[PDB]
Design a protein around this nucleic acid. Structure first.
Ligand SMILES: [Cl-]
Ligand SMILES: [Cl-]
Ligand SMILES: [Cl-]
Ligand SMILES: [Cl-]
Ligand SMILES: [K+]
Ligand SMILES: [Mg+2]
Ligand SMILES: [Mg+2]
Ligand SMILES: [Mg+2]
Ligand SMILES: [Mg+2]
Ligand SMILES: [Mg+2]
Ligand SMILES: [Mg+2]
Ligand SMILES: [Mg+2]
Ligand SMILES: [Mg+2]
Ligand SMILES: [Mg+2]
Ligand SMILES: [Mg+2]
Ligand SMILES: [Mg+2]
Ligand SMILES: [Mg+2]
Ligand SMILES: [Mg+2]
Ligand SMILES: [Mg+2]
Ligand SMILES: [Mg+2]
Ligand SMILES: [Mg+2]
Ligand SMILES: [Mg+2]
Ligand SMILES: [Mg+2]
Ligand code: NA
Ligand code: NA
Ligand code: NA
Ligand code: NA
Ligand code: NA
Ligand code: NA
Ligand code: NA
Ligand code: NA
Ligand SMILES: [Sr+2]
Ligand SMILES: [Sr+2]
Ligand SMILES: [Sr+2]
Ligand SMILES: [Sr+2]
Ligand SMILES: [Sr+2]
Ligand SMILES: [Sr+2]
Ligand SMILES: [Sr+2]
Ligand SMILES: [Sr+2]
Ligand SMILES: [Sr+2]
Ligand SMILES: [Sr+2]
Ligand SMILES: [Sr+2]
Ligand SMILES: [Sr+2]
Ligand SMILES: [Sr+2]
Ligand SMILES: [Sr+2]
Ligand SMILES: [Sr+2]
Ligand SMILES: [Sr+2]
Lengths: 194, 237, 92, 56
RNA sequence: AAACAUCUCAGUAUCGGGAGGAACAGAAAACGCAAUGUGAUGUCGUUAGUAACCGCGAGUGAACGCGAUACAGCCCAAACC
RNA sequence: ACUCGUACGGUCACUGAAUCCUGCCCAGUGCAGGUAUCUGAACACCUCGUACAAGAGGACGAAGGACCUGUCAACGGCGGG
RNA sequence: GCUUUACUGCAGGCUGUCGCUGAGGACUCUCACUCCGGGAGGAGGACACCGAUAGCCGGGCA
């Protein structure tokens, strides 16, 4: 039969309809009054969290992060530039907001490592994402067959190097064939043209 | 070119800042729960550096000692009241609703409880004209009819120091001393007297703006100089 | 100059002389779906857009005849070199 | 008053001093920032790729 | 580009953040020598200055495949408990 | 920042103590106001086109402009016959 | 370097539109949101602010 989880999932396919709509309208009032990074005892979207690797266990942390909506916040050129490099208003950044969110969360918890993250909505001026972080130093995790991998040294600060799922997508690594000529194995090795 | 003086101002550097560390106090009305059971005695009259007008130190019943925006005619010993039931006499504060029409007032709040925003300068006053259950109509010093919430508090009488403007500075040195007590860069160099690089009016053999002075409201900073969005100019017509 | 609306001349289609009707070539409306239209959208962005920032050239003092020659029997038209003419009015 | 020799006589202010962190006489005692190693400004050590030729 | 604005120089210089002894990538919602065919991923040689881009100017410029190197394939979420 | 400031304020400009004065010009340019009618983009809407889409046309029309008015201690002008 | 009714652009301001954004060609309301208030509460209100986009102005700047 259907899992109870599928109902949370199904609710979130249309965050603007049904009960979920009223919940968001209510919640966001409280969220707008919270900080940039707020640790939370439980995921707002359980199905998604468990699906991304979450577990109700010691060493597993979840934090909601908010970021200002819109494009880049850039300063106009102070020195000479050709029309092409004078743009200021319509220029957007190369990292999506979810990625910016994952990084802020990881800075707040220097000892934890980003596992994954997901969207929990937005209003007209900001977006919220919840991030799952793991304590690579806690034995409950060092002994977990499904998560101990994140304890390896080369997984340190993984988010800052784009090793996250959101990181990999944003780097154009989804496709294994056509279109990934300049993304795989890295944007850098391909001269930064992807 | 280079940023014009109006643009240097905004950075709020020392040259353009007000000597705040030398200012005395923020003359906002007292906050009373209700009842008007708040009265104090004028303990002294002081000089207010930020306004070139006198201010009065008051000792209230509950022990609070604070400076107040003094109207003309207030002296030491006198007793002042602040509240809904305050008496209708010079130097007393109460909501416009309690003030009888046709009474000159000063230090009028814009939004009930803000402490006073209007008519605070030397010898000026707002004129309470119309009352109502929903809107109190006041005539501000500029002659503008302002609709205010009857719950907006004010002080009866006119501000002390009137006539200050009637005497000429006579000397540059006198202007100088006053200017040193304000957030203002002085003296003033005319735009037409500067180099083209420093102002829209700079440059040219003889001095003269090389353009009409009436500038559009939409002009960007750096260009909005001269006569801003003038509806007209001159004295004629 | 004057020009006869219809006259006998060679029709490269029938391959024989037949009566033709002469008409001024009317401009055909664009579709906005040609490759050039797509390149304009693709290559125009922030700042100067190269060739897509240029504007309409000038005009020669006189233009050449721009006519269609329609065969009166097979109904097909053919084109010819034009010649400079200040004005071109047809007779009948 | 000339900007040269006569204006050099007024110079008796102490600014740059031996830095506690790197040992260079670059710790600005007024800013409390070392212009050589960055002490007082950053935990990380002051460094720049332009301190050497690009390909070296 | 014998000017110059798209283009070029170049994702170069330089800047911010971060890991390791190497990084990154990686077990197909691939490829599309179209097939009765190949079978994770780097890299090297080639494919090729080819396809593609471009005031269609100056210039920019892959991939599939093939020959090599080395080879390795697995774990969750959910269903049922 | 101005600002512990509030029109007897302070911002932006011009002239440059006192004294006697400061004429005519609103066509152009600038600023500002108004505007029946005209013109005026995108989204949504309607027609055609496409089993869809590109696209073509339409209707509506903001600021702006046309047009009208105010204004020279606003740019400036005050000739030839 | 400087100028402007040189060319081409870029900030910025005005303006429409879409999202924030809710209930019953003009309107009421309150619940988001904004502001005032120490607080209770008051004012305002689906506007404004902010994101996106479109038109106009645009030597302030390149
Ligand atoms: Cl991390
Ligand atoms: Cl003054
Ligand atoms: Cl013709
Ligand atoms: Cl193959
Ligand atoms: K260039
Ligand atoms: Mg298992
Ligand atoms: Mg590599
Ligand atoms: Mg005060
Ligand atoms: Mg000063
Ligand atoms: Mg002056
Ligand atoms: Mg000079
Ligand atoms: Mg000079
Ligand atoms: Mg200038
Ligand atoms: Mg002059
Ligand atoms: Mg050249
Ligand atoms: Mg390029
Ligand atoms: Mg050429
Ligand atoms: Mg290239
Ligand atoms: Mg291929
Ligand atoms: Mg003068
Ligand atoms: Mg002089
Ligand atoms: Mg506030
Ligand atoms: Mg220039
Ligand atoms: Na971390
Ligand atoms: Na790309
Ligand atoms: Na393109
Ligand atoms: Na050259
Ligand atoms: Na040159
Ligand atoms: Na090009
Ligand atoms: Na082969
Ligand atoms: Na005129
Ligand atoms: Sr670290
Ligand atoms: Sr105040
Ligand atoms: Sr206050
Ligand atoms: Sr001048
Ligand atoms: Sr006059
Ligand atoms: Sr493009
Ligand atoms: Sr452009
Ligand atoms: Sr010509
Ligand atoms: Sr000197
Ligand atoms: Sr000397
Ligand atoms: Sr000295
Ligand atoms: Sr510091
Ligand atoms: Sr460095
Ligand atoms: Sr293999
Ligand atoms: Sr005089
Ligand atoms: Sr005029």
């Amino acid at each position: 039969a259907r899992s109870a989880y599928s109902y949370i999932r199904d609710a979130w396919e249309n965050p603007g309809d049904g009960q979920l709509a009223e919940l968001q309208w209510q919640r966001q009032q409280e969220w707008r009054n919270e900080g940039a990074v707020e640790r939370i005892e439980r995921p707002t979207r359980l199905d998604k969290a468990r699906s991304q690797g979450y577990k109700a266990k010691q060493g597993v942390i979840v934090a909601r992060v908010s970021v200002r909506k819109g494009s880049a916040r850039k300063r106009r050129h102070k020195a000479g530039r050709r029309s092409k490099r004078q743009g200021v208003t319509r220029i957007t950044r190369r990292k999506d907001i979810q990625r910016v969110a994952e990084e802020r969360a990881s800075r707040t918890f220097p000892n934890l490592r980003v596992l994954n993250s997901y969207s929990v909505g937005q209003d007209g001026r900001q977006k919220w994402h919840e991030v799952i972080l793991i304590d690579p130093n806690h034995p409950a995790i060092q002994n977990d067959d499904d998560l101990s991998w994140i304890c390896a040294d080369d997984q340190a600060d993984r988010v800052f190097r784009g090793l996250t799922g959101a990181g990999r997508r944003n780097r154009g690594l989804s496709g294994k064939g056509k279109g990934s000529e300049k993304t795989r194995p890295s944007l850098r090795s391909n001269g930064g043209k992807a | 070119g280079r940023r014009i003086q109006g643009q240097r101002r905004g950075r709020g550097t020392s040259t353009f800042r007000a000597p705040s560390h030398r200012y005395k106090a923020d003359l906002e009305h007292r906050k009373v729960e209700d009842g008007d059971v708040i009265a104090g005695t004028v303990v002294d009259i002081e000089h207010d550096p930020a306004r070139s007008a006198p201010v009065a130190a008051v000792e209230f019943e509950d022990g609070d000692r604070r400076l107040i925006l003094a109207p003309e005619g207030v002296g030491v010993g006198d007793e002042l009241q602040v509240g809904v039931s305050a008496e209708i006499a010079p130097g007393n504060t109460l909501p416009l609703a309690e003030i009888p029409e046709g009474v000159p007032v000063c230090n009028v709040e814009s939004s009930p409880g803000d402490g006073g925003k209007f008519a605070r300068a030397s010898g000026v006053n707002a004129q309470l004209l119309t009352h109502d259950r929903n809107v109190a109509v006041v005539k501000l010093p500029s002659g503008e009819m302002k609709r205010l919430d009857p719950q907006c508090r004010a002080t009866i009488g006119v501000v002390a120091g009137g006539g200050r403007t009637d005497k000429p500075f006579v000397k540059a040195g006198n202007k100088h001393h006053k200017m040193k007590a304000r957030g203002t860069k002085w003296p003033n160099v005319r735009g037409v007297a500067m180099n083209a690089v420093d102002h829209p009016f700079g440059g040219g053999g003889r001095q003269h703006p090389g353009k009409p002075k009436s500038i559009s409201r939409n002009a960007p900073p750096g260009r909005k100089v001269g006569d801003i969005a003038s509806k007209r100019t001159g004295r004629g017509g | 100059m004057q020009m006869p609306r219809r006259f006998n001349t060679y029709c490269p289609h029938c391959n024989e002389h037949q009566e033709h009707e002469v008409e001024k070539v009317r401009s055909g409306r664009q579709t906005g779906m040609k490759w050039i239209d797509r390149q304009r959208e693709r290559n125009s962005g922030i700042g100067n857009d190269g060739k897509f920032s240029k504007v309409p050239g000038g005009d020669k003092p006189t233009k050449k005849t721009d006519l269609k020659y329609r065969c009166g029997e097979c109904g097909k038209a053919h084109l010819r070199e034009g010649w400079r003419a200040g004005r071109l009015e047809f007779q009948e | 008053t000339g900007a040269g020799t006569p204006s050099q006589g007024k110079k008796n202010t102490t600014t740059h001093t031996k830095c506690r962190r790197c040992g260079e006489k670059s710790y600005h005692t007024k800013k409390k920032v070392c212009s050589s190693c960055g002490f007082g400004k950053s935990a990380k050590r002051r460094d720049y790729e332009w301190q050497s030729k690009a390909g070296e």
